[PDB]
Amino acid sequence: DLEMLAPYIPMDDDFQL
Amino acid sequence: QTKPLPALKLALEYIVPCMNKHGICVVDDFLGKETGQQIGDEVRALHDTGKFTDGQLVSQKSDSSKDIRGDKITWIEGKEPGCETIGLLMSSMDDLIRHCNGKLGSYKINGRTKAMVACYPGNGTGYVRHVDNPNGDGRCVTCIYYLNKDWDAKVSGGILRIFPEGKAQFADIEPKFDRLLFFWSDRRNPHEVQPAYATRYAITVWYFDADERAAAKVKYLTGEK
Ligand SMILES: O=C(O)CNC(=O)C(=O)O
Ligand SMILES: [Mn+2]
């Protein structure tokens, strides 16, 4: 449902703050 | 001084209170015409590489992803040559989030995604109503920077409609140039990009809450039933 609508994002390339 | 305003002031005196109270926060003229233009040029240049790819969903479904979102996108870390100004944008966004200290909800923002440079070709494509992070993938704050000069939704549509949870009134955010948008990525802010009838550029970065993100990644790895 919502899961299939949510904007995909990499789970791997996060930028650290 | 050039844009943007000091992040400390803006974040603590606006974004933070604004976010905690509304969960949706708009900062217009974030970077100013010069910069907004530059990034709008880097984005169009990037778009002209023809590299953009149809927007994808967390858990793909329905015939096509185009049934959900009709934008073409590309990810930028911000240090690519020809995207130094997007990097600038990203660093500005990061500065604002950093200065919100730990007052953005219960969130400890310790990271974000690369910038999602998005573009709705302007052929009536949009993004059906959705929650950026409905399952807890770590995204707590959605930050969007619009690059659409003189955008008139009455004509070109492209309105980002947000439906703040619990309310029967929705917010219509125009994808206007130099506009920075912040809103809770979770279920509190379902939203849709109404059909854009003109090329609609936006740069999105999602900030991650340390704990939920850490748990997002770990849970991503597994499939549990
Ligand atoms: O671009 C906008 O105004 C809104 N975009 C999204 O909600 C998205 O990409 O998931
Ligand atoms: Mn979204």
mmCIF file of C-alpha atoms and ligand atoms in Angstrom:
data_model
loop_
_atom_site.group_PDB
_atom_site.id
_atom_site.type_symbol
_atom_site.label_atom_id
_atom_site.label_comp_id
_atom_site.label_asym_id
_atom_site.label_seq_id
_atom_site.Cartn_x
_atom_site.Cartn_y
_atom_site.Cartn_z
ATOM 1 C CA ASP A 1 0.000 0.000 0.000
ATOM 2 C CA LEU A 2 1.757 3.183 1.201
ATOM 3 C CA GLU A 3 5.016 1.274 0.952
ATOM 4 C CA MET A 4 4.507 1.009 -2.801
ATOM 5 C CA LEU A 5 3.900 4.742 -3.167
ATOM 6 C CA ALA A 6 6.763 6.040 -1.060
ATOM 7 C CA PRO A 7 9.679 7.642 -2.976
ATOM 8 C CA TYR A 8 12.466 5.111 -3.301
ATOM 9 C CA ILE A 9 15.770 5.900 -1.606
ATOM 10 C CA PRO A 10 19.050 4.048 -1.405
ATOM 11 C CA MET A 11 19.471 2.207 1.852
ATOM 12 C CA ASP A 12 23.260 2.321 1.267
ATOM 13 C CA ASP A 13 24.445 5.780 0.184
ATOM 14 C CA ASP A 14 23.617 8.036 3.117
ATOM 15 C CA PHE A 15 25.562 11.267 3.619
ATOM 16 C CA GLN A 16 26.682 11.854 7.192
ATOM 17 C CA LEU A 17 25.806 15.141 8.876
ATOM 18 C CA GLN B 1 25.308 39.066 2.233
ATOM 19 C CA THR B 2 24.303 36.424 -0.294
ATOM 20 C CA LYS B 3 21.554 33.966 0.515
ATOM 21 C CA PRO B 4 20.719 32.062 2.526
ATOM 22 C CA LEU B 5 20.141 33.763 5.865
ATOM 23 C CA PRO B 6 22.147 32.486 8.834
ATOM 24 C CA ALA B 7 20.872 28.964 9.407
ATOM 25 C CA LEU B 8 21.035 29.267 13.175
ATOM 26 C CA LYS B 9 18.509 32.082 13.234
ATOM 27 C CA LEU B 10 16.268 30.632 10.526
ATOM 28 C CA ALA B 11 16.295 27.140 11.982
ATOM 29 C CA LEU B 12 15.851 28.008 15.650
ATOM 30 C CA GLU B 13 13.479 30.914 15.122
ATOM 31 C CA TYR B 14 11.528 29.488 12.209
ATOM 32 C CA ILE B 15 12.090 25.971 10.893
ATOM 33 C CA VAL B 16 12.185 24.384 14.331
ATOM 34 C CA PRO B 17 9.133 26.059 15.803
ATOM 35 C CA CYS B 18 7.444 25.867 12.411
ATOM 36 C CA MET B 19 8.234 22.169 12.038
ATOM 37 C CA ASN B 20 7.191 21.193 15.541
ATOM 38 C CA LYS B 21 3.950 23.127 15.227
ATOM 39 C CA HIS B 22 3.046 22.352 11.629
ATOM 40 C CA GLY B 23 5.425 19.707 10.364
ATOM 41 C CA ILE B 24 5.478 21.656 7.111
ATOM 42 C CA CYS B 25 7.830 24.540 6.618
ATOM 43 C CA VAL B 26 8.435 26.757 3.650
ATOM 44 C CA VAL B 27 11.398 29.041 3.234
ATOM 45 C CA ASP B 28 11.113 31.185 0.154
ATOM 46 C CA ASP B 29 14.061 32.829 -1.588
ATOM 47 C CA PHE B 30 16.245 30.302 0.156
ATOM 48 C CA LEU B 31 19.332 30.933 -1.925
ATOM 49 C CA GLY B 32 18.319 33.924 -4.007
ATOM 50 C CA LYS B 33 18.025 34.413 -7.755
ATOM 51 C CA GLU B 34 21.744 34.016 -8.596
ATOM 52 C CA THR B 35 22.176 30.676 -6.892
ATOM 53 C CA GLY B 36 18.705 29.409 -7.616
ATOM 54 C CA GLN B 37 19.492 30.111 -11.279
ATOM 55 C CA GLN B 38 22.837 28.375 -11.117
ATOM 56 C CA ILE B 39 21.386 25.248 -9.664
ATOM 57 C CA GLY B 40 18.449 25.435 -12.039
ATOM 58 C CA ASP B 41 21.107 25.470 -14.741
ATOM 59 C CA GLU B 42 23.064 22.585 -13.278
ATOM 60 C CA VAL B 43 19.844 20.649 -13.017
ATOM 61 C CA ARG B 44 18.785 21.359 -16.581
ATOM 62 C CA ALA B 45 22.346 20.540 -17.679
ATOM 63 C CA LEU B 46 22.066 17.298 -15.721
ATOM 64 C CA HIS B 47 18.681 16.713 -17.270
ATOM 65 C CA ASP B 48 20.135 17.281 -20.738
ATOM 66 C CA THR B 49 22.605 14.477 -20.154
ATOM 67 C CA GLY B 50 19.400 12.477 -20.578
ATOM 68 C CA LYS B 51 20.668 10.550 -17.582
ATOM 69 C CA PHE B 52 17.623 10.986 -15.361
ATOM 70 C CA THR B 53 15.678 7.838 -14.593
ATOM 71 C CA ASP B 54 11.992 7.309 -13.880
ATOM 72 C CA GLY B 55 11.289 7.853 -10.199
ATOM 73 C CA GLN B 56 11.186 4.625 -8.229
ATOM 74 C CA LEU B 57 9.234 3.494 -5.196
ATOM 75 C CA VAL B 58 10.424 1.932 -1.978
ATOM 76 C CA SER B 59 8.502 -1.260 -2.672
ATOM 77 C CA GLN B 60 7.664 -1.208 -6.367
ATOM 78 C CA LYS B 61 4.162 -2.154 -7.504
ATOM 79 C CA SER B 62 1.230 -1.666 -9.886
ATOM 80 C CA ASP B 63 1.968 -2.186 -13.626
ATOM 81 C CA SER B 64 4.555 0.582 -13.611
ATOM 82 C CA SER B 65 6.239 3.019 -11.239
ATOM 83 C CA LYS B 66 4.966 5.637 -13.649
ATOM 84 C CA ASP B 67 1.543 4.801 -12.252
ATOM 85 C CA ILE B 68 2.715 6.285 -8.954
ATOM 86 C CA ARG B 69 5.277 8.920 -9.863
ATOM 87 C CA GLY B 70 5.873 10.501 -13.237
ATOM 88 C CA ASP B 71 9.116 12.300 -12.559
ATOM 89 C CA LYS B 72 12.549 11.510 -13.990
ATOM 90 C CA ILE B 73 15.314 11.869 -11.421
ATOM 91 C CA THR B 74 19.002 11.635 -10.665
ATOM 92 C CA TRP B 75 20.923 11.510 -7.432
ATOM 93 C CA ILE B 76 23.658 13.986 -6.645
ATOM 94 C CA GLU B 77 26.096 13.821 -3.761
ATOM 95 C CA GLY B 78 26.786 17.424 -4.606
ATOM 96 C CA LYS B 79 30.481 17.276 -5.437
ATOM 97 C CA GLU B 80 30.080 16.232 -9.043
ATOM 98 C CA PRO B 81 31.537 18.679 -11.496
ATOM 99 C CA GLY B 82 28.653 20.719 -12.905
ATOM 100 C CA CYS B 83 26.654 20.275 -9.711
ATOM 101 C CA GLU B 84 28.774 22.342 -7.338
ATOM 102 C CA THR B 85 25.852 24.690 -6.761
ATOM 103 C CA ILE B 86 23.535 21.806 -6.006
ATOM 104 C CA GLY B 87 26.231 20.805 -3.577
ATOM 105 C CA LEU B 88 25.914 24.346 -2.268
ATOM 106 C CA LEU B 89 22.158 23.895 -1.891
ATOM 107 C CA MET B 90 22.670 20.576 -0.161
ATOM 108 C CA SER B 91 25.194 22.074 2.233
ATOM 109 C CA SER B 92 22.801 24.929 2.968
ATOM 110 C CA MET B 93 19.979 22.489 3.643
ATOM 111 C CA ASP B 94 22.403 20.528 5.838
ATOM 112 C CA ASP B 95 23.354 23.710 7.704
ATOM 113 C CA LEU B 96 19.695 24.421 8.504
ATOM 114 C CA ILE B 97 19.089 20.899 9.719
ATOM 115 C CA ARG B 98 22.298 21.016 11.744
ATOM 116 C CA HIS B 99 21.207 24.215 13.421
ATOM 117 C CA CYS B 100 17.845 22.779 14.375
ATOM 118 C CA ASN B 101 20.010 20.939 16.919
ATOM 119 C CA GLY B 102 17.916 18.163 18.400
ATOM 120 C CA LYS B 103 14.673 20.088 18.223
ATOM 121 C CA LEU B 104 13.181 18.652 15.060
ATOM 122 C CA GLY B 105 10.661 16.415 16.745
ATOM 123 C CA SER B 106 12.268 13.584 18.700
ATOM 124 C CA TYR B 107 14.725 13.251 15.838
ATOM 125 C CA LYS B 108 18.485 13.038 15.930
ATOM 126 C CA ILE B 109 19.352 13.938 12.360
ATOM 127 C CA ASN B 110 22.759 12.406 11.686
ATOM 128 C CA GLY B 111 22.525 11.959 7.952
ATOM 129 C CA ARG B 112 20.594 12.402 4.747
ATOM 130 C CA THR B 113 20.188 10.938 1.286
ATOM 131 C CA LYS B 114 22.028 12.302 -1.713
ATOM 132 C CA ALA B 115 19.969 15.013 -3.353
ATOM 133 C CA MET B 116 17.212 13.615 -5.497
ATOM 134 C CA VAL B 117 17.125 15.970 -8.428
ATOM 135 C CA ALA B 118 13.638 15.456 -9.734
ATOM 136 C CA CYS B 119 11.896 16.578 -12.816
ATOM 137 C CA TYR B 120 8.339 16.129 -13.896
ATOM 138 C CA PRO B 121 8.790 16.479 -17.681
ATOM 139 C CA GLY B 122 5.650 18.609 -17.602
ATOM 140 C CA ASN B 123 3.446 16.231 -19.543
ATOM 141 C CA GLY B 124 0.823 15.920 -16.863
ATOM 142 C CA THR B 125 2.927 13.618 -14.749
ATOM 143 C CA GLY B 126 2.821 13.940 -11.002
ATOM 144 C CA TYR B 127 3.192 11.842 -7.902
ATOM 145 C CA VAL B 128 0.110 10.198 -6.481
ATOM 146 C CA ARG B 129 -0.586 10.861 -2.842
ATOM 147 C CA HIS B 130 1.989 9.121 -0.734
ATOM 148 C CA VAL B 131 3.999 9.262 2.444
ATOM 149 C CA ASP B 132 7.710 9.565 1.831
ATOM 150 C CA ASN B 133 8.429 7.287 4.772
ATOM 151 C CA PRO B 134 5.314 5.266 5.803
ATOM 152 C CA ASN B 135 7.206 2.242 7.116
ATOM 153 C CA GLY B 136 10.049 3.817 9.083
ATOM 154 C CA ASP B 137 12.937 3.779 6.615
ATOM 155 C CA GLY B 138 14.671 6.431 8.691
ATOM 156 C CA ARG B 139 13.473 9.485 6.797
ATOM 157 C CA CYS B 140 12.180 12.009 9.281
ATOM 158 C CA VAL B 141 12.477 15.213 7.314
ATOM 159 C CA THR B 142 11.837 15.772 3.668
ATOM 160 C CA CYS B 143 13.568 18.812 2.330
ATOM 161 C CA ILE B 144 12.723 20.081 -1.095
ATOM 162 C CA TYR B 145 14.161 22.910 -3.110
ATOM 163 C CA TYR B 146 12.086 24.104 -6.044
ATOM 164 C CA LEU B 147 13.641 25.570 -9.199
ATOM 165 C CA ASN B 148 10.575 26.641 -11.088
ATOM 166 C CA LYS B 149 10.703 30.237 -12.202
ATOM 167 C CA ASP B 150 7.378 32.034 -12.357
ATOM 168 C CA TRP B 151 5.562 28.787 -11.691
ATOM 169 C CA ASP B 152 1.817 29.268 -11.916
ATOM 170 C CA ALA B 153 0.055 26.099 -10.828
ATOM 171 C CA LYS B 154 -3.236 27.463 -12.087
ATOM 172 C CA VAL B 155 -1.566 26.990 -15.443
ATOM 173 C CA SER B 156 1.167 24.391 -15.025
ATOM 174 C CA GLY B 157 -0.274 22.522 -12.044
ATOM 175 C CA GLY B 158 2.568 20.792 -10.261
ATOM 176 C CA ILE B 159 1.263 21.748 -6.860
ATOM 177 C CA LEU B 160 2.713 19.750 -4.031
ATOM 178 C CA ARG B 161 -0.393 19.067 -1.987
ATOM 179 C CA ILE B 162 0.331 17.999 1.577
ATOM 180 C CA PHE B 163 -2.340 16.557 3.816
ATOM 181 C CA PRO B 164 -1.099 17.193 7.366
ATOM 182 C CA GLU B 165 -2.286 14.249 9.417
ATOM 183 C CA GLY B 166 -5.431 14.814 11.448
ATOM 184 C CA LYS B 167 -6.585 17.835 9.474
ATOM 185 C CA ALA B 168 -9.265 18.118 6.799
ATOM 186 C CA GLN B 169 -7.363 20.993 5.205
ATOM 187 C CA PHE B 170 -4.423 20.369 2.912
ATOM 188 C CA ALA B 171 -1.534 22.673 2.115
ATOM 189 C CA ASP B 172 -0.846 23.635 -1.502
ATOM 190 C CA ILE B 173 2.839 24.273 -1.973
ATOM 191 C CA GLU B 174 3.750 25.775 -5.322
ATOM 192 C CA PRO B 175 6.971 24.375 -6.772
ATOM 193 C CA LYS B 176 8.235 27.938 -7.000
ATOM 194 C CA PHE B 177 11.807 28.927 -7.694
ATOM 195 C CA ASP B 178 14.195 29.191 -4.770
ATOM 196 C CA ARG B 179 11.550 27.783 -2.447
ATOM 197 C CA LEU B 180 12.821 25.455 0.226
ATOM 198 C CA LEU B 181 10.342 23.050 1.724
ATOM 199 C CA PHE B 182 10.563 21.020 4.902
ATOM 200 C CA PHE B 183 8.004 18.549 6.163
ATOM 201 C CA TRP B 184 7.925 15.406 8.246
ATOM 202 C CA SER B 185 8.627 12.497 5.948
ATOM 203 C CA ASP B 186 6.468 10.076 7.944
ATOM 204 C CA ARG B 187 2.710 9.495 7.969
ATOM 205 C CA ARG B 188 1.986 12.947 9.270
ATOM 206 C CA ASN B 189 2.472 14.364 5.802
ATOM 207 C CA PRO B 190 0.855 12.432 2.998
ATOM 208 C CA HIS B 191 1.293 14.481 -0.137
ATOM 209 C CA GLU B 192 1.060 14.425 -3.868
ATOM 210 C CA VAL B 193 2.611 16.310 -6.695
ATOM 211 C CA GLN B 194 -0.389 17.318 -8.715
ATOM 212 C CA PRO B 195 -0.058 16.872 -12.494
ATOM 213 C CA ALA B 196 2.670 19.181 -13.719
ATOM 214 C CA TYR B 197 1.948 20.568 -17.168
ATOM 215 C CA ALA B 198 5.338 22.159 -17.484
ATOM 216 C CA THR B 199 8.814 20.975 -16.605
ATOM 217 C CA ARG B 200 8.945 20.917 -12.841
ATOM 218 C CA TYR B 201 12.325 20.760 -11.155
ATOM 219 C CA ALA B 202 12.857 20.031 -7.518
ATOM 220 C CA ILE B 203 15.774 18.882 -5.471
ATOM 221 C CA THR B 204 14.873 16.650 -2.570
ATOM 222 C CA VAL B 205 16.998 15.449 0.272
ATOM 223 C CA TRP B 206 15.636 13.340 3.070
ATOM 224 C CA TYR B 207 17.144 13.681 6.489
ATOM 225 C CA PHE B 208 17.493 10.584 8.602
ATOM 226 C CA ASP B 209 16.854 10.129 12.291
ATOM 227 C CA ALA B 210 19.869 8.200 13.608
ATOM 228 C CA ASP B 211 17.994 5.454 15.479
ATOM 229 C CA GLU B 212 15.148 4.877 13.030
ATOM 230 C CA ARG B 213 17.607 4.933 10.130
ATOM 231 C CA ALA B 214 19.986 2.548 11.865
ATOM 232 C CA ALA B 215 16.990 0.277 12.450
ATOM 233 C CA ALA B 216 15.756 0.940 8.923
ATOM 234 C CA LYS B 217 18.966 -0.348 7.380
ATOM 235 C CA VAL B 218 19.124 -3.417 9.641
ATOM 236 C CA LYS B 219 15.489 -4.318 8.964
ATOM 237 C CA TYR B 220 16.018 -3.654 5.246
ATOM 238 C CA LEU B 221 18.623 -6.411 5.259
ATOM 239 C CA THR B 222 16.210 -8.951 6.582
ATOM 240 C CA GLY B 223 12.920 -10.166 5.371
ATOM 241 C CA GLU B 224 10.889 -11.312 8.326
ATOM 242 C CA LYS B 225 7.622 -13.171 8.507
HETATM 243 O O1 LIG C 1 8.483 17.548 -5.701
HETATM 244 C C1 LIG C 1 7.607 17.656 -4.867
HETATM 245 O O2 LIG C 1 6.989 18.820 -4.694
HETATM 246 C C2 LIG C 1 7.196 16.498 -4.022
HETATM 247 N N1 LIG C 1 7.991 15.305 -4.347
HETATM 248 C C3 LIG C 1 7.753 14.149 -3.697
HETATM 249 O O3 LIG C 1 6.874 14.082 -2.862
HETATM 250 C C4 LIG C 1 8.566 12.938 -3.977
HETATM 251 O O4 LIG C 1 9.449 12.962 -4.801
HETATM 252 O O5 LIG C 1 8.310 11.819 -3.293
HETATM 253 MN MN MN C 2 7.069 12.712 -1.408
#
